[PDB]
Design a protein. Structure first.
Ligand SMILES: [Zn+2]
Ligand SMILES: [Zn+2]
Lengths: 766, 770
């Protein structure tokens, strides 16, 4: 027995903390305190969506969402949450779904009260000015014309067509000039009645997440949540027909199960993490090995208080009938396999799934809690969930370029629906297998040869190896897809051992990234050399299907995103290697193992771009790069961006309705920093958009002289506060050290308006 | 629809992360990364306890637990975990339970690998030397004789007597000179078969928690957990038997014991506990106190086998009459039925409140809870099914009274005076319980015209804390203190739901009223403190009297060395002083006005030396307790004291506990008592006398008088660099952080650091020669 008498002084860990409340008005509150965090975020969810709009007002809810950003009893639209977030360099978005609606933002810690002040106000007392309604009728009709051509929007309408239950399921919900009406006065009282009936506190939930303490978060809830007003069932979905949908693009198989909507939905996040696992033995490895398919994602959509659709969305290869039957047969057997997961496997994959979640940004964590997949809990009723789903009614949507039927107006969208030509399911008897025990990491042999290696922040912890091609074009598009296909099994294995391996584009720059312990990078780099040398023909084929899918996906994007895709190639055989962290002996063993990397490793040693599109949509992407390498410039470009961005949006989006995409931002692309302008319009031509951007630049030429030195100091403090702090997670942190060089920049701060005005004109005149 | 094109680049929040693995060898690993934490901790739990010892070797497990801290293949007892935790100033302990055993430590972050090295080595390859066995038989037999006088040990033996199911339940498990026997080489073969059978990786779970990344913790778990043995039993559930009355000195108790399946999710028990211990009006404690049926409760949970547990509700009662016991059971059953009605919002509020108390624990204690106690709550845990499982479970009653009849008998090697349970009838229907649901806004209190003084450190800084403390030790009686607690305890629980804090607690000898929260909250709470504390109804003064007598009886039934620590503040020695630590000038000034109506005169804080204190006990236990106060209050002084204590602490332990078994309690530690800092020595022995123990401490101070000059400058530089890192950090929680600022003065203590040997020994002189 212990020989101690008095306990040693003890200091608590200071971890994440949660708390739940119900205000006296009926608002539910969920606070999450994350000490030390950079960002704070908030989200209000309302229990009403599209399905709750009156049958006579299609898209009423969509319109209400737009209009809440158009001014409230204590804030005009500019001083409201939209304009305040933009000045602040925050994030902000909202979503109207079938049965629920949500509004949410992300800012720095301190200005949280001001943000909730405005979120609370727009939710409680929107102006709903007839004049604003008139404007947003046009904005939605534009979004409606654009949505008539969107693959996902039409896929989701098609999926709902596979089920029945109630009228709203198959209604039009986007809205349109036709549907909103000529009587702007009767539209505005429909809005007021919807808002008055559903935007009550007993019908809302507020999530709060920031570095603030639970006590500070409670007070903000009481203060801003207390100022919301105080004061009906859908039947469940029944399975109908399978279908085929004809759409341009890579073919899909979407298996859609109709499920009850349970309170405990974290199991679905663990299911997602297993479904998306690339490891050998899993579902994706099997589909690729047989060239049945290449990717999957999970859709979950609540359709009512006790009714939901869960959709497994496969990108497939041939789109043939026997392909679909093999895929569905594989999914049902894999779901069976998941019954055998041991407690340790459920915990391992469950907490793997939750750390994918904790790595999202606050805004996106709150989104997932409110409308997406919650965090996993280790004592859910896993096998009871599994048995619910495998028995749930399920229908199949094949999406194909040629599919049959003729186009038809369904839910206000053009849907070409034809019968599903299915083959018989053939039992999948081959066993699936999943990670369980992690063995000791092999110790690779070192080559005698040796390649050059940059080593930064030596002998610091959490080492990261970054391998990148010399330039844009030193690695081809088809080679990347070959890299990703071959390393995908192995990166999955490394993720269980807590290593990271990825091959991804980061701001136009292909990076191979390797991180973990010292053993992990050594073993992993060895695995990379072998996986990429003798490439079996499955993986060449898969790489060719992935590239085809990537091309088809691009041709079917909206033009402004397609123009952004085209920016890297408009701005422009050896690789470079940089190790960030780790000791000297790590640097040297990696030096040897890099010699067996299949590509030679060498040691590391633009005028404005205008892109346009014409036709059914008009788009302008203007990139004004900074020619210099100076610290004072790259600082000024960021201060300029921050001052320009809210002005650009307010002038061209809210005042004049130039189009649905309106954005001026700082952007880095293939190591070139510069200012980005983006516009896409249904009416104005690309050249008309370039004219209005030039007009905005001329405006800024004379307006920034007059910026209150109050506004400038607050802007240069705010951006030095965002920027001096390197990232937490070491992959983002390793790029910021090796590539972006955030450190050297807040160095040149602050500066005078004379120096800023100087950098302005150097940037936007020839 | 959104008008953006490119995503704004964002940084993740750097929160807590968790991961689980299984090594090739079968070890389960559960990691928790706590970025920025000061401490790291590790626990290994082994699926074997006392019930698993062979019937022929009473106490084999207890001995194995003692003998694993006596050296292993790569580490002596001094270089091993015990001595190494002592050096680095960390925490260490172990527990053998009915069917499970755990070893765990807590240290600073960086040296975690060193501790895993030692922990791994002692779990895998203990020496188990005969000379140390025979030596440890003595320590345990002394622990046996002491435990035959422990109230809780005997209570836990009586509870098992109310159940049946398998032989080990009622066996003797402490061990004794008698039970261990004279054939020491046969004892050593028994240990080693026990170890070699149960101490293998497939039977072990490793918990690690620190500021390290998940990838680092994973690497450490591989390195040290992979060096554990490889290569790969049930007990039947428990039947209810008899109720009992157990006769023991001390405040009467009632213990209601439910026999349960041992399920895999037990976090619902932590929510039940948060509800059980809630002082709010409408709940269970408030009802017992309003009727003077009893004054406290706690929850016990004991795994007994793979699908058998005992859950025990342990009430400190008032009178202990048959009628009182039946009122308390009637209330508990009604209350458990009340918890059925909790809404999902109430389940989420109390479950997360519960987890917040879990997260206030130190790393070491979180790991203990996970492995052996109440895990964290999960918000979708079939609450009503587990409540329905509990309300349908067989249950038995143990009244514990100072005189209960029957006559002593030897049961589980313990003296137990079991009597029949005198049982009244339940009260057929009884009043409804109610629980917090909605939080209304907080009342704004009105100011008085008067005004009081109030310092104000760290102005206009967030998370303010109001500390009211009496002027000295005799400014508030141990009677009024118990009356303050009884009047605020209701009001403190309600502020806890709104996330403020209100406490009247003794902090290192200093009574302290603490209030923390928003500015609105402190004002409201301070106003409530005044109203609740002005006029106390006889109910509240009775409650205080019951609580005072309970404190007295607990004290005079504790182990001697603990009773002497309780006397140290008295042996060292009516207005109040007001401090605010954070907040506006307007907070300070309105607080200033609201303090005028504090029923005790507040004054401004004013601005001597104490000889050493020797406390002693003689009788069946012999205990000595010496506090050598530092008599100045210079910085270099209050630093040197902390260096010495760090240097002394393992030396005191290695010589007196290990090298000479001088007793089962042995400790040298810096200590701080009613504002006096100093060095504290504590010893308790079943053979040496208090004056003989004083002699070894006298002797020990001379060894360091000479030996201290000869300390490797690297060990001193190292000792001051670990001291300085830990000390310069101010606490996370704002209350501790408030005390450290406004009382302890932690910042100043390290201003003087480092120090050279000449004034370290200069300070050692003043402390002990005078
Ligand atoms: Zn012991
Ligand atoms: Zn829209």
């Amino acid at each position: 027995h212990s020989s101690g008498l008095v306990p040693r002084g003890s200091h608590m860990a200071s971890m994440t903390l949660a708390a739940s409340w119900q205000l006296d008005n009926g608002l539910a509150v969920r606070a999450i305190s994350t000490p030390g965090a950079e960002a704070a975020a908030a989200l209000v969810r309302i229990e009403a969506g599209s399905f709750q709009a009156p049958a006579a007002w299609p898209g009423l809810a969509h319109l209400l969402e737009h209009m809440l950003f158009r001014g409230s009893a204590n804030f005009s639209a500019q001083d409201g949450l939209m304009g305040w977030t933009q000045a602040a360099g925050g994030r902000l978005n909202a979503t109207t779904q079938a049965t629920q609606t949500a509004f949410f933002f992300e800012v720095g810690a301190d200005p949280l009260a001001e943000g909730l002040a405005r979120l609370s106000d727009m939710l409680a007392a929107p102006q709903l000015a007839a004049e604003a309604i008139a404007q947003e009728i046009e904005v939605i009709d534009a979004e409606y014309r654009l949505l008539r051509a969107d693959g996902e929007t039409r896929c989701e309408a098609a999926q709902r067509q596979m089920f029945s239950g109630f009228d709203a399921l198959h209604r039009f919900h986007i809205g349109s000039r036709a549907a909103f009406g000529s009587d702007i006065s009767a539209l505005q009282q429909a809005l007021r009645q919807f808002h008055h009936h559903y935007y009550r506190a007993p019908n809302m939930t507020l999530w709060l997440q920031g570095p603030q303490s639970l006590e500070q978060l409670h007070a903000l809830a009481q203060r801003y949540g207390g100022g919301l007003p105080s004061g009906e069932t859908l039947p469940p979905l029944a399975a109908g027909q399978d279908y085929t949908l004809s759409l341009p693009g890579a073919p899909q198989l979407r298996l859609v199960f109709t499920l009850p909507h349970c309170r405990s939905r974290g199991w679905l996040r663990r299911l997602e993490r297993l479904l998306l696992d690339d490891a050998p033995g899993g579902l994706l490895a099997r589909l690729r090995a047989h060239a049945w398919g290449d990717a999957v994602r999970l859709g979950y959509a609540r359709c009512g208080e006790n009714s939901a659709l869960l959709s497994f969305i496969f990108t497939v290869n041939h789109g043939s009938a026997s392909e679909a039957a093999h895929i569905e047969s594989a999914l049902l057997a894999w779901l069976q396999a998941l019954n055998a997961l041991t407690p340790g496997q459920l915990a391992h994959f469950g907490q793997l799934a939750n750390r994918d979640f904790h790595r999202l940004a606050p805004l996106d964590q709150l989104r997932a809690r409110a409308l997406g997949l919650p965090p996993t809990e280790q004592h859910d009723d896993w096998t009871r969930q599994l048995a619910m789903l495998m028995a749930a009614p399920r229908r199949r949507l094949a999406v194909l370029p040629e599919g049959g039927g003729e186009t038809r107006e369904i839910q206000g969208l053009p849907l070409t629906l034809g019968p599903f030509v299915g083959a018989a399911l053939t039992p999948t008897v081959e066993p699936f297998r999943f990670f369980s025990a992690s063995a000791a990491l092999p110790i690779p042999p070192l080559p005698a040869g040796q390649a050059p290696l940059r080593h930064l922040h030596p002998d610091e912890a959490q080492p990261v190896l970054l391998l990148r091609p010399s330039s844009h074009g030193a690695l081809s598009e088809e080679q990347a897809c070959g890299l990703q296909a071959a390393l995908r099994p192995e990166a999955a294995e490394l993720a269980h051992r807590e290593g990271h391996l990825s091959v991804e584009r980061h701001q136009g720059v292909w990076l191979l990234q390797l991180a973990g312990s010292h053993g992990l990078i050594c073993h992993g780099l060895n695995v990379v050399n072998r996986a990429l040398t003798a490439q079996p023909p499955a993986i060449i084929n898969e790489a060719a299907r992935n590239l085809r899918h990537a091309q088809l996906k691009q041709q079917n994007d909206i033009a402004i995103r397609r123009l952004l895709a085209q920016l890297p190639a408009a701005l422009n055989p050896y690789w470079h290697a940089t190790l960030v962290g780790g000791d000297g002996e790590l640097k040297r063993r990696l030096s040897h193992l890099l010699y067996d990397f299949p590509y030679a490793i060498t040691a590391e040693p633009h005028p404005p771009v205008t892109l346009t599109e014409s036709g059914a949509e008009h788009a302008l992407l203007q990139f004004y790069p900074l020619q210099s390498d100076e610290a004072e410039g790259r600082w000024a470009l960021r201060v300029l961006a921050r001052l320009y961005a809210p002005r650009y949006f307010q002038r061209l989006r809210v005042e004049r309705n130039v189009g649905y995409v309106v954005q001026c931002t700082f952007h880095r692309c293939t190591h070139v920093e510069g200012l980005l302008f983006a516009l896409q319009s249904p009416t104005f031509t690309a050249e008309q958009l370039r004219q209005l951007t030039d007009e905005f630049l001329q405006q800024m030429h004379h307006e920034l002289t007059h910026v209150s030195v109050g506004e400038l100091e607050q802007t240069q403090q705010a951006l030095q506060q965002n920027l001096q702090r390197l990232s937490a997670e070491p992959l983002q942190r390793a790029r910021e050290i090796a590539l972006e060089n955030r450190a050297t920049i807040a160095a040149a701060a602050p500066i005078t308006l004379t120096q800023l005005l100087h950098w302005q004109q150097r940037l936007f005149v020839a």
